[PDB]
Amino acid sequence: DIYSRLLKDRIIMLGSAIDDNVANSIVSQLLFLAAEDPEKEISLYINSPGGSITAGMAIYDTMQFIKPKVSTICIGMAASMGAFLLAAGEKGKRYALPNSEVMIHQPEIAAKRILLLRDKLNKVLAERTGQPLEVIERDTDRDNFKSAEEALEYGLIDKILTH
Amino acid sequence: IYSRLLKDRIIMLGSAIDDNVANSIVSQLLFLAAEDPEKEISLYINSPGGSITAGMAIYDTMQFIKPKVSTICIGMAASMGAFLLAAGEKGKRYALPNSEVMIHQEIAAKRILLLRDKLNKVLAERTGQPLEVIERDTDRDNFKSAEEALEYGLIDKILTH
């Protein structure tokens, strides 16, 4: 019911791990909200431990494709593909709460596609964050946690919500 | 359930705090602030505690929303439930006479460490209590009573006859 109220307000809640069911859910909601008003914003709230790289790449592609801008907001934690979806939000509308945390660490389908998707993830990260590619390469390979401050400085968010 | 309770701007935190409970409480807080940004919220806490990241989500949300969030400990507020009690609005942190509060309290252990230290520091500012006695009291197995908790800085006032 709270999810329904949020959706009437063009709000999507990604509060669980990302597998194919969550991917289809978020994708359907994105497409629906864009069908209702192609030029009104969507806000994607992220409290996700991360998950499947293919599912997350699906969500990311849909975010790009729809005409609305998708602002992203980190509530509790954005890890793995959740951190990537956060960093892939609308220019200027990437937010985190003060005590939020962001680890861009990232752990039946052919291995080759996994490698190639991982490389697109890497380069998209580099362009949206400004870091040299090789740096994004290293940091998405090691366990490492940042905070709203350190993330913002890294360029994974655009603003912290204070006061 | 407890939707009728929501209508009266009352939120019930009666289970352990994980990410689902978190998201629930967060959504309801945001909703109650949307409905009327300047009317109070009452968060009743009967919680054994739980995840530090989930609880921290709830806390951030409490700060952000315009309404004042009064917190009331009914049965027990432990771990992040105690932290959420102590983090209620100034002057509107309550407990019932036989409540109990123990501030005793996937993720890197180094991160757990820094998280804890930040939590300690918030509780310090929130209770007006030296940080060293805050860090020492989370090592103990002590439980403060309602009255004990009031003279410590965890709740503002106790309600009775």
Partner: peptide, 6 residues
């Protein structure tokens, strides 16, 4: 989280 997210 409005204002302003939305």
């Amino acid at each position: 989280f409005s204002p302003x997210a939305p």
